Design an enzyme around this catalytic site. Sequence first.
Site, PDB file in Angstrom:
ATOM      1  N   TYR A  27       0.760  -1.256   0.000  1.00 16.13           N
ATOM      2  CA  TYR A  27       0.000   0.000   0.000  1.00 16.13           C
ATOM      3  C   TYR A  27       0.784   1.295   0.000  1.00 16.13           C
ATOM      4  O   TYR A  27       0.192   2.344  -0.255  1.00 16.13           O
ATOM      5  CB  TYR A  27      -0.989  -0.003   1.180  1.00 16.13           C
ATOM      6  CG  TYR A  27      -2.059  -1.042   0.969  1.00 16.13           C
ATOM      7  CD1 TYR A  27      -1.888  -2.341   1.405  1.00 16.13           C
ATOM      8  CD2 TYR A  27      -3.205  -0.737   0.253  1.00 16.13           C
ATOM      9  CE1 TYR A  27      -2.826  -3.294   1.170  1.00 16.13           C
ATOM     10  CE2 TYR A  27      -4.155  -1.694   0.004  1.00 16.13           C
ATOM     11  CZ  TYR A  27      -3.971  -2.971   0.472  1.00 16.13           C
ATOM     12  OH  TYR A  27      -4.937  -3.927   0.214  1.00 16.13           O
ATOM     13  N   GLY A  29       2.714   4.072  -1.451  1.00 10.11           N
ATOM     14  CA  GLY A  29       2.980   4.609  -2.768  1.00 10.11           C
ATOM     15  C   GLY A  29       2.563   3.609  -3.821  1.00 10.11           C
ATOM     16  O   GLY A  29       3.277   2.641  -4.081  1.00 10.11           O
ATOM     17  N   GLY A  31      -0.720   1.393  -4.621  1.00 11.41           N
ATOM     18  CA  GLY A  31      -1.176   0.115  -4.120  1.00 11.41           C
ATOM     19  C   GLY A  31      -2.618   0.167  -3.670  1.00 11.41           C
ATOM     20  O   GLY A  31      -3.005   1.098  -2.964  1.00 11.41           O
ATOM     21  N   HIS A  47      -3.720   5.231   5.423  1.00 15.85           N
ATOM     22  CA  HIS A  47      -3.522   6.506   4.767  1.00 15.85           C
ATOM     23  C   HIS A  47      -4.240   6.523   3.423  1.00 15.85           C
ATOM     24  O   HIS A  47      -4.867   7.521   3.076  1.00 15.85           O
ATOM     25  CB  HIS A  47      -2.031   6.746   4.599  1.00 15.85           C
ATOM     26  CG  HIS A  47      -1.707   8.089   4.025  1.00 15.85           C
ATOM     27  ND1 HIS A  47      -1.152   8.234   2.775  1.00 15.85           N
ATOM     28  CD2 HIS A  47      -1.797   9.327   4.549  1.00 15.85           C
ATOM     29  CE1 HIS A  47      -0.975   9.521   2.529  1.00 15.85           C
ATOM     30  NE2 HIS A  47      -1.343  10.206   3.592  1.00 15.85           N
ATOM     31  N   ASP A  48      -4.178   5.429   2.686  1.00 15.65           N
ATOM     32  CA  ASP A  48      -4.878   5.339   1.419  1.00 15.65           C
ATOM     33  C   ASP A  48      -6.396   5.442   1.662  1.00 15.65           C
ATOM     34  O   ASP A  48      -7.103   6.124   0.930  1.00 15.65           O
ATOM     35  CB  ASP A  48      -4.592   4.030   0.716  1.00 15.65           C
ATOM     36  CG  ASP A  48      -3.153   3.894   0.244  1.00 15.65           C
ATOM     37  OD1 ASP A  48      -2.398   4.878   0.177  1.00 15.65           O
ATOM     38  OD2 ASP A  48      -2.698   2.758  -0.043  1.00 15.65           O
ATOM     39  N   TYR A  51      -7.275   9.115   2.406  1.00 16.65           N
ATOM     40  CA  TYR A  51      -7.396   9.889   1.188  1.00 16.65           C
ATOM     41  C   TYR A  51      -8.675   9.506   0.471  1.00 16.65           C
ATOM     42  O   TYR A  51      -9.338  10.356  -0.137  1.00 16.65           O
ATOM     43  CB  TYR A  51      -6.211   9.616   0.270  1.00 16.65           C
ATOM     44  CG  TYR A  51      -4.956  10.417   0.564  1.00 16.65           C
ATOM     45  CD1 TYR A  51      -4.844  11.240   1.669  1.00 16.65           C
ATOM     46  CD2 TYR A  51      -3.887  10.323  -0.289  1.00 16.65           C
ATOM     47  CE1 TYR A  51      -3.681  11.959   1.894  1.00 16.65           C
ATOM     48  CE2 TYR A  51      -2.738  11.033  -0.081  1.00 16.65           C
ATOM     49  CZ  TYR A  51      -2.631  11.848   1.010  1.00 16.65           C
ATOM     50  OH  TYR A  51      -1.447  12.541   1.188  1.00 16.65           O
ATOM     51  N   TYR A  64      -0.952  22.183   2.319  1.00 18.41           N
ATOM     52  CA  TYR A  64      -1.457  22.589   3.623  1.00 18.41           C
ATOM     53  C   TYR A  64      -0.287  23.127   4.436  1.00 18.41           C
ATOM     54  O   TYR A  64       0.852  22.926   4.077  1.00 18.41           O
ATOM     55  CB  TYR A  64      -2.110  21.405   4.368  1.00 18.41           C
ATOM     56  CG  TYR A  64      -1.235  20.178   4.438  1.00 18.41           C
ATOM     57  CD1 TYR A  64      -0.164  20.120   5.312  1.00 18.41           C
ATOM     58  CD2 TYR A  64      -1.467  19.082   3.618  1.00 18.41           C
ATOM     59  CE1 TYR A  64       0.668  19.013   5.361  1.00 18.41           C
ATOM     60  CE2 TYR A  64      -0.656  17.972   3.665  1.00 18.41           C
ATOM     61  CZ  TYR A  64       0.413  17.942   4.561  1.00 18.41           C
ATOM     62  OH  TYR A  64       1.233  16.838   4.601  1.00 18.41           O
ATOM     63  N   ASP A  89      -2.139  12.890   6.595  1.00 16.32           N
ATOM     64  CA  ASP A  89      -0.693  12.827   6.474  1.00 16.32           C
ATOM     65  C   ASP A  89      -0.041  12.763   7.836  1.00 16.32           C
ATOM     66  O   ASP A  89       0.882  11.947   8.036  1.00 16.32           O
ATOM     67  CB  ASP A  89      -0.160  14.019   5.670  1.00 16.32           C
ATOM     68  CG  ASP A  89      -0.421  13.893   4.191  1.00 16.32           C
ATOM     69  OD1 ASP A  89      -1.095  12.939   3.748  1.00 16.32           O
ATOM     70  OD2 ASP A  89       0.044  14.763   3.422  1.00 16.32           O
TER      71      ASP A  89
END
Lengths: 121, 4
Positions: A27, A29, A31, A47-48, A51, A64, A89
């Site tokens: 996952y 970067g 995936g 994190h995925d 998002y 941000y 993040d």
Amino acid sequence: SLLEFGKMILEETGKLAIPSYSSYGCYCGWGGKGTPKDATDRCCFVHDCCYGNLPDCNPKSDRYKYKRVNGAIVCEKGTSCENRICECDKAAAICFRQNLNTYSKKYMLYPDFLCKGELKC
Amino acid sequence: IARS
């Protein structure tokens, strides 16, 4: 933005986002399938998903602002999308830090075919 | 840029 996430990752872990976390496991970067390989990869899975919670935001490019209050990351107020991206993040960067102890270089450049099955967020 |  991706560059800001990368700077946050470096600040937290001392590892460069590229290449330490840009191709890690299933996952990190690029995936979207498979069982996360370890706790670090689960940080990326979450994190995925995080998002994924923001379909009308553009987490890779929208910038941000954040500051440090004695080590702690504090997301500063921007647009609603920016605030939510920053929180995603921040969580991932903290998660990477929390799991540095199990980070394994063998998961860098992890081959896609070893990542099968869809895991619901 | 790589995804997430």
